[PDB]
Amino acid sequence: AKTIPFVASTALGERLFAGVQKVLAAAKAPVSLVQTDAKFAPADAKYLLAEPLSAAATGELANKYGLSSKVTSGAASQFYPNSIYPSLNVEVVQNLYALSNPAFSSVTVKDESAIKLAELQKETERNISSFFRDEANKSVQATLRLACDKAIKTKADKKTVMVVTKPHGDAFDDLLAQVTKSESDGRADELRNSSVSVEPTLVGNAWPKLVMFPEGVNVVVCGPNASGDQVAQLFVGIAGGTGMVAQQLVGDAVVFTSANAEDNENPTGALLAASNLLTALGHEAEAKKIAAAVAKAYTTDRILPKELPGGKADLEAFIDAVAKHAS
Amino acid sequence: VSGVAPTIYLRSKAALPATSTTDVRPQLYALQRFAKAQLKTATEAERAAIEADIARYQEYLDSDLEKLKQDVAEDTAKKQKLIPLLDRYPDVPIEKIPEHANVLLKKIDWPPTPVTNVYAPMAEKLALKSNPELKVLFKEALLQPAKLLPLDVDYQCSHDREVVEAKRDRYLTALVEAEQAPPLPFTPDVLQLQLEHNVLKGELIDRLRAPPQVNPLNAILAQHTAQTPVHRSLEKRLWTEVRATAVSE
Amino acid sequence: LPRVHPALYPNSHLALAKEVAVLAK
Amino acid sequence: DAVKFQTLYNVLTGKQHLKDQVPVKDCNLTAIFGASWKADLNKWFDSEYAPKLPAAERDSAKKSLDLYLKRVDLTRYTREELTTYGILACGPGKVDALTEKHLLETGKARLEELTAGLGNKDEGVNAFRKEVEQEGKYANWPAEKSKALADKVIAAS
Amino acid sequence: LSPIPEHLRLVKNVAQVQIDMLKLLNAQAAK
Amino acid sequence: NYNFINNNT
Amino acid sequence: VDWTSLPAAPPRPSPSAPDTLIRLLGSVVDDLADADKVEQKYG
């Protein structure tokens, strides 16, 4: 039985540990979850599961495991009741260098001493700032390369569209524009083959597209500005609200997550996270079992949680229903 | 501004997120990764010193910064113990000096040396920011800011109300940042200034009792920066920022 | 040339810590 | 007439981008149109576009049109109000209840701010009524509805 | 000719600079 | 020499 | 008729900022007006 860690600094994370452990034991998989904390997680552990991270906790975890990007997955819109977005096969990607480093924004006379001192100081600052800029550009390159690989791996319908939010102005947006230019003008080959339509657009002209017709889009990319946080929250909600979407964090290692506010308790995002994790490790049959159990809970019994419209029920009873449907 | 708007632009200063946090762990991790990068260009001696430094930062992370807070508290304790000893002539305060100077000029009664007065201009800004009228407008603008901006013209001019809401939202942030901004643009290191004031006071009295204009101090810092690698210089920015929080909490 | 105190030197407290403990008592 | 409604159907279904770097929105569309948006759209649909084409495509298009209408009713809101102040975090079906909650809560907060800055609950309530009436007038909102909301917030305070 | 008055005026200027620094820090601390 | 040192200049 | 286009809104007269807001924000109103033009163009 493998020991996949499980970060949790809250009673929400604790009760979800208990529930998910019950589910996974009923599903009969050869792994076990280990209660830990975001600041004491064990390095050299590539595939992990987690709970709603705060911004600071995402920053810490990313700095630890070398993470670069956070992906979403709104598969639960099919299960949402009176679903306005059935089969929302798109993906949002948000960079993370702000949380991994929030402080990135930041000759009286010709005497030999003072000019020497200023030269040394500016050389030091040059080295530092050059390193930080190279790191930011590398993280952005990782995000864009991930989005391109994702759009390519998806079943290309001859469009394979990538929207890229780009409010002109700040340094993150400038870097992002530069990197889009670089990749598009550089590769062009898989691009023109799979017909991947890259598109830098503005927020006011992008988020209505995402809302009305996400059929015309497959991937979305955003930097770590307020705009990007807003678009990520938009998708996180539109997929069925905080709790229904399955988030993911990638880079040099994978950790799955479920978004949830203070008052929310829906664990379906975390169950889909567990399923994605098990598919990554190899237990695809168990992942399909879990997904079928979720679908049975939402369709046969239709036992919806309290926050959600329509029916209403508690977290633990919902997980009991999920486990009984699985086994 | 077509369409029956569902909501109204009501805002609360409590709802406006005003945290102004100062995180330490990500700054530390960035320092760690920077040292890891410099390791590749480092030679063997500096490679060893840098490995010790890296292990030190990992110890800090595993101990949850308490070791670093202890270390910076030790250094600041040394400093705060140092200054009152350099308080040479405390019974002779500083404003009483120009009186002595007037006395000596009266008693005694050439290329002069200039001075770079930086802290007097900032004193002029206090003559403005400390006014009561300037604070009254702050007290009365945030409570009713719609009076200032031409909202009626803006609503008629723009078909979409989202743009109008964004303009109003930015003005508050510009005002909130203005009132809470200090007279200074930077965070003054109080100890390193009281040090100079206590040493400089220790020099004028020795001069009152009784060529070039170069500052040999600059021919030392130019050597100190050369000796040290970069990660220690960045580490100073970390230790300084921790003195702000530890003194706050 | 002018004079400078060992406290106005950089990183002074490190080497002056002994005199401090001897003096502040 | 039929031209404008065909253009509208095309824009909703996404077969056409609007004639600039412009987004689709309830505001940025109904401003062009005569503010009889949904009623006349559905009417023209059920008259001239449903009987033409077969029944399978008819059902699919009816579904899609209802979805896109709900989506533009969702587009009515602002980005910041949607995300930051938590209107959508529960979901589209709960957007309405969350709007009501957000309105009453921010009303209470604004009331407390006015009373703390001024005191004199009569004066504060008067200034609050003026502010709400002006904001409704600005947002093209029924003044009677705004007055009812103001009295409601005061009674609930 | 003598450097005494110029030295004394240097002292006056530097002392006023230091007093202005002190007043700035005092007003900042008060705020 | 008679000049005075000022670290912040 | 071109419904797909957007109609010319009423003309915006000159800003004519107020002395109170200027005294509160000396060197920021220019930046804010430039950003307002940017937002009227894009956003």
Residue numbers in the entry:
A (entry chain B): 3 to 108, 117 to 337
B (entry chain H): 17 to 125, 259 to 359, 438 to 476
C (entry chain A): 463 to 487
D (entry chain C): 12 to 168
E (entry chain N): 82 to 112
F (entry chain T): 50 to 58
G (entry chain M): 222 to 264
Task: Tell me, in the authors' exact words, what the paper reports.
The mitochondrial ATP synthase is a membrane protein complex that generates most of the ATP in eukaryotic cells. The translocation of protons through the membrane-bound Fo part, mediated by subunit a, drives the rotation of a membrane-embedded c-ring and the attached central stalk, which together form the rotor. The torque of the rotor against the stator subunits induces conformational changes in the (αβ)3 headpiece, thereby triggering catalysis. To reveal how the mitochondrial ATP synthase is modulated by lipids and organised into a dimer shaping discoid cristae in Euglenozoan mitochondria, we determined the structure of the ATP synthase dimer from E. gracilis.
Symmetry expansion of the pseudo-C2-symmetric dimer particles was used to classify individual F1/c-ring monomers into rotational states 1, 2 and 3 and resolve structures at 3.0- to 3.9 Å resolution. Using masked refinement, maps of the membrane region, the rotor and the peripheral stalk tip were refined to 2.8 and 3.3 and 3.8 Å resolution, respectively, enabling the construction of atomic models. By contrast, subunit b is significantly shorter in E. gracilis, extending only ~65 Å into the matrix, and does not interact with OSCP. This is compensated by extensions of OSCP and subunit d mediating the attachment of the peripheral stalk, which is augmented by two species-specific soluble subunits ATPTB3 and ATPTB4. The additional elements significantly increase the size of the peripheral stalk compared to yeast. The C-terminal OSCP extension contains a 13-residue proline-rich region, followed by 26 residues arranged in two helices (D240-L246, V250-A265), which contact the large matrix extension of subunit d. This interaction is further clamped by ATPTB3 and ATPTB4 of the peripheral stalk tip and p18 on F1. Thus, the E. gracilis peripheral stalk displays a different mode of interaction with the OSCP compared to all other reported ATP synthase structures. ATPTB3 is an isocitrate dehydrogenase ortholog that adopts a Rossman fold located at the tip of the peripheral stalk. The OSCP N-terminal domain contains a structurally conserved bundle of four α-helices, followed by the N-terminal extension with a terminal helix. The N-terminal helix of OSCP connects to the central stalk through an interaction with the C-terminal extension of subunit γ of the central stalk.
